Write a structure and sequence with these properties.
Belongs to the type II topoisomerase GyrB family. By secondary structure, this protein is of the alpha+beta class. The chain has a single domain (1-194), classed as Histidine kinase-like ATPase, C-terminal domain (Heat Shock Protein 90, 2-Layer Sandwich), CATH 3.30.565.10. It contains 6 helices and 9 strands, in the order αααββααβββββαββ. The longest helix has 20 residues, at 28-47. The N and C termini lie far apart (50 Å). Bound molecules: ligand 087 and magnesium ion (3 copies).
């Protein structure tokens, strides 16, 4: 309960109290904005010269998974908070605050690190769960139905349109959209402009 952790909790309270001020609306438009908030991080990492693939998956029950092959959100214990950098970054994330559940897997230092959250609150300390020969960041989230009180169901065409545009605007980045909500009938569109 240091000043750092107190500020974190106040920040989550503030986002959840006035979500529309952060993401425009809590309508279907705001729901889809959650995806762009996450994907923008991957785009910046690609433009910085450290990533070139981004994958957005609509999973069963309208979870969203975003994966990039960037450097991975750092995990070193931070000066300000005395907590892993990734935890500080995600506990101040609007998407995390407005998600009933969110998971991160960081591939970095030939290690896979995992943390989970509910409404932005970490459920356990960042944990090493395995090894890897890749780098990057995986984020999985389920939008909070307490916040998004019109719908929590994503529109494939809405995601598709903007993903295609993002690939066209940010040449060289391979951006893939896949709908896995119905395991019997899976749709994928992959964009890569030169
Ligand atoms: C899906 C996704 N991807 C990213 C992402 O790629 N973030 C970048 C931000 C800058 N990062 C680094 C890397 C280093 C480093 N030298 O490896 C040091 C620092 Cl100080 N930040 C790499 C991850 C985020 Cl954040 C989310 Cl959410
Ligand atoms: Mg942002
Ligand atoms: Mg950034
Ligand atoms: Mg490329």
């Amino acid at each position: 309960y240091g000043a750092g952790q107190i500020q974190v909790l106040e920040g989550l309270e503030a986002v959840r109290k006035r979500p529309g001020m952060y993401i425009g609306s809590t309508s279907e438009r705001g729901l889809h904005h959650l995806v762009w908030e996450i994907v923008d991080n991957s785009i910046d990492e690609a433009l910085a010269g450290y990533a070139n693939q981004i994958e957005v998956v609509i999973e069963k029950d309208n979870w969203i998974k975003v994966t990039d092959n960037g450097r991975g959100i750092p995990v070193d214990i931070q000066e300000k908070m005395g907590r892993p950098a990734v935890e500080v970054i995600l506990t101040s994330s609007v998407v995390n605050a407005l998600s009933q559940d969110l998971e991160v897997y960081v591939h970095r230092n030939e290690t896979i690190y995992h943390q989970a959250y509910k409404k932005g609150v970490p459920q356990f300390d960042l944990k090493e769960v395995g090894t890897t020969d890749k780098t990057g960041t995986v984020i999985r989230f389920k939008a909070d139905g307490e916040i998004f009180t019109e719908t929590t169901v994503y529109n494939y065409e809405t995601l598709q349109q903007r993903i295609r545009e993002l690939a066209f605007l940010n040449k060289g980045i391979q951006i893939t959209l896949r709908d896995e909500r119905d395991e019997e009938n899976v749709r994928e569109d992959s964009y890569h402009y030169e």
